[PDB]
Design a protein around this ligand. Structure first.
Ligand SMILES: [Cl-]
Ligand SMILES: [Cu+]
Ligand SMILES: [Cu+]
Length: 98
């Protein structure tokens, strides 16, 4: 198994919460293959550096409203390691699917 914070399995999906503060914490997350996922970004840092979230392997690039939650939804059908980052590719995270 891979190191990192595992998503919680429940009600036909899996969910993990990521705090946006000077980057992402946790910045290492672990998801189950083939299970619809909710990656909930709670934005607490108003830096323009963190205005967007990007999952390049999944085609996601979206605005994160300050002081609010925003949910990235993906269903990872392939095992492996996938990156995520801010819209500037300056702040980073890693998602392992297994
Ligand atoms: Cl910046
Ligand atoms: Cu950034
Ligand atoms: Cu930046």
């Amino acid at each position: 198994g891979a190191m990192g914070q595992k998503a919680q399995q429940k009600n036909g999906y899996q969910e993990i919460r990521v705090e946006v503060m000077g980057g992402y914490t946790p910045e290492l997350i672990v998801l189950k293959k083939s299970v619809p996922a909710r990656i909930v970004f709670d934005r607490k840092d108003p830096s323009p550096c963190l205005d967007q979230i990007v999952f390049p392997d999944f085609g996601v690039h979206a605005n994160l409203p300050m002081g609010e939650e925003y949910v990235v939804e993906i269903t990872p059908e392939q095992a492996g390691e996938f990156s995520f980052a801010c819209g500037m590719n300056m702040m980073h995270g890693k998602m392992i699917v297994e």
